[PDB]
Amino acid sequence: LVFYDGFDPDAGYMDFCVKNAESLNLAAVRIFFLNAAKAKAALSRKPERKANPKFGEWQVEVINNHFPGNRNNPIGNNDLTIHRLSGYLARWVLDQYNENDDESQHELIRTTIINPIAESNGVGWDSGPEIYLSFFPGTEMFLETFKFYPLTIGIHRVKQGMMDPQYLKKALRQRYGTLTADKWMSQKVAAIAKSLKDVEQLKWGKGGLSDTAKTFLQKFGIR
Amino acid sequence: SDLVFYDVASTGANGFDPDAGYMDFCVKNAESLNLAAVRIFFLNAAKAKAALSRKPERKANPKFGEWQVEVINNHFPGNRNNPIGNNDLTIHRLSGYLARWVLDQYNENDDESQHELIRTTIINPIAESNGVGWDSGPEIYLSFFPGTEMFLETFKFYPLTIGIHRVKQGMMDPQYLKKALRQRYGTLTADKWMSQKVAAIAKSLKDVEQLKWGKGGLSDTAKTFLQKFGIR
Amino acid sequence: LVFYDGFDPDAGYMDFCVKNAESLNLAAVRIFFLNAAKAKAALSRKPERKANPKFGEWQVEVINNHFPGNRNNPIGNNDLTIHRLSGYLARWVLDQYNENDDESQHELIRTTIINPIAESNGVGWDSGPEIYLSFFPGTEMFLETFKFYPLTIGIHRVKQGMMDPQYLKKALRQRYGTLTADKWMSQKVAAIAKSLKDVEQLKWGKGGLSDTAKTFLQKFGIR
Amino acid sequence: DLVFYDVASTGANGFDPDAGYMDFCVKNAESLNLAAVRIFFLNAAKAKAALSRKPERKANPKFGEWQVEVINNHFPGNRNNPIGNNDLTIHRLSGYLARWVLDQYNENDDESQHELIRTTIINPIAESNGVGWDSGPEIYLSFFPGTEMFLETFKFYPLTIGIHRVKQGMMDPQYLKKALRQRYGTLTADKWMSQKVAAIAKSLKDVEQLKWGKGGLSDTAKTFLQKFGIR
RNA sequence: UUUUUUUUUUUUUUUUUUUUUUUUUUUUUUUUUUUUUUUUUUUU
């Protein structure tokens, strides 16, 4: 009853890869990305402080504070949330891709791994492995790795009134490799603007069902 | 809530024709059907869904009244990708096939005695739970069963438009409409019937919109009673 | 896998009184009726199937299906919900009152036991023990005991657009002692109409939120 | 946990916040300063939660280097413990101190001392709706709880903030009731609700014209984002 | 359908208690894809 008055994800990734490089494969991760949603829900229902969900055949200790009451429980730099997984695991896939040149293996990834959030906006692997994987949440942790895309997708989304600005706040504090938010907002402006044009010219069309159906339903007042 | 998650494949197409599966079904079963059997089913459908999501077996054989049948189970979490041939049965597909079977019965004759029996016997909890009864029409009453989006023509678009009205009122999550929107109107693609049969649909909607949408109906004696005290 | 095709509160009361006559007193009950609300809330947050809430110093096993998902879990004729307590417990108070003639004890009840729903409509013990206690939910289970008041309050409420009719449905199926809904709707019409006049002439303004305030808030688009 | 207790029935007592405020300033003016208070306002909710564990009737918490005798009935069992119009709860402190800060600001027109105050003292709730000192002192501090004790002094803002909050469905209307029974200096609610209606609607318009974000965003971020056509 | 269940109504008090609570490479709240497939709301 008496009163007075630093998380690095690059580090967290090395930690995470170490403990799990062993147990990972495409089919496991694929299944994670599909149910990233489903678990956010369930964990909000569970009152517990931790949980060990299983994706396919890869169980993992994640911290739960999706439950209403836990939302403010502090978290160590090696701890996992679904968000942090989504980020780390996205980065993993990219690393799997750049590992090699194999068109056969590259095609396996584009076949196995699938990103609903991206596909829901008509964006596919053909657009770019970076830009594709940037739609997964948690990629704001690795702006240099993902070429500002996780940011600029957000920017572009906010510009079209499809996202509440307050969801950018996560990304705007994050580093660019070894630069503070305050520094790179100043230095990397053109680079960011390049990375936005790149985002702008994607097809933001397909994904929202067929076009016929899009419109049909609009006729009877819906979205 | 036991936080086990699984794959969800693509395996595109499958070309499932419900009219095809329906005939195969009537052939194999017409023999063993009757209002008592079916009546029961429609009341224990959701019951049977829940119970199959415990039983880990791939196939099951439930029994309604005195009618047993081979259904495919993948209500159970792990089984949700088990592939299904266009003659096989899920609860869903039965609910659709049987809903149509009942319609055929009604339309078979104009016997006021047999229609009597049908209204009286068979019952759609979902319809009644929106304050809707047989008197609104047969086609519209049975369209409230799930599975009837397999036969959009046969039920005069009502399965689609019920869904649309449901969304328009924020009574339903739009994900659940998507089922219908990929279905056919007898011999058309969605792409086609969405383009052409728009007027026909808006009619079907108007009909659905003019139903006594109550949620939890009342008894008829209660209204005439309350109407004594100036309530209506 | 194989399929085919009624709760009597008079009985449920005897069961309930038996198991709890022992542990009850005014100060306990009083506290229940105050937090009847607060528990409806909390139980909706708890995912569990049962709960043992404590009112003052009287703990009790009640069935929870205030949680969204449990709402359809079937319930035995001896089981308690808050609603069924509220009813039973209301009946208990009346029985306490008619037990005796003691003006001293009668005054202890009017002092100890308090009904917000009644007082919020300006209705107090002076109106009648029956009519007062009829504002408590769950009294529809005992229409004969509470002289059609639980019903007619509802009727009168609906007449003044202060209640959605659909809340009367509970009461309209309930018995009058040993008569079906279908029978007494026919036979007891005058009696009901007497019990409604009785209701009509109470004071519906006082006790609640002051009329000045009612309006004030309306001016800034509020009720 | 579901452990329900009884409820107070006694009425009116007399708690005159202007009275209790002077007694308080008298007893404590001595020991107060921006550092102490600054701290309080940041650990107020912290202290609430901690007192609802400590079963004692009274407590003596300390902020910065300022200790004080508060009355605890955050603890479940204690919620009916009766309180004299000179005693302190966290709530009443929040109100008293919010007023103390205002007196400080108004004491002079020293741009140097106002500087210090804006810089030091900080209302998490105001900042967490995207509101800062620049919106005005009276309006900024009204976001503290307890300031409904002094509706005049804070230009109705404590009431109208609450109203706007409900109008937006950001708040449960039960929590407005506190204010609606309070005074406007020398009037009953009954009176000031009747008469000072225009004055209130003004105070509302002011509150409604605040930059109601929710969660701040650094000033550099806005000017940055304004390069890409975002505000 | 229901002698079921659930969702509105929960008193006065210049009283008391209960939601809001900034900086942060923290945390939480949006976006979650194709098939006349399958699963997941609707159930008198």
Swiss-Prot record, chain D:
Give the domain of life.
Viruses
Predominant place of localization: virion
**GO MF assignments:** RNA binding
Q: Which InterPro entries match?
A: Bunya_nucleocap, Bunya_nucleocap_C, Bunya_nucleocap_N
One GO cellular component term noted in the UniProt record for this chain: viral nucleocapsid
One GO biological process this protein is involved in is:
symbiont-mediated suppression of host gene expression
Where in the cell does this protein reside? Virion
UniProt free text on domains: The N-terminus and C-terminus are involved in homooligomerization and play an essential role in viral RNA synthesis.
What does the record give as the function of this protein? Encapsidates the genome protecting it from nucleases. The encapsidated genomic RNA is termed the nucleocapsid (NC) and serves as template for transcription and replication. The NC have a helical organization. Seems to participate in the nuclear relocalization of host PABP1, thereby inhibiting host cellular translation.
Assembly? Homotetramer. Binds the viral genomic RNA. Interacts with host PABP1.
Protein family (similarity comment): Belongs to the orthobunyavirus nucleocapsid protein family.
Q: What is this protein called?
A: Nucleoprotein
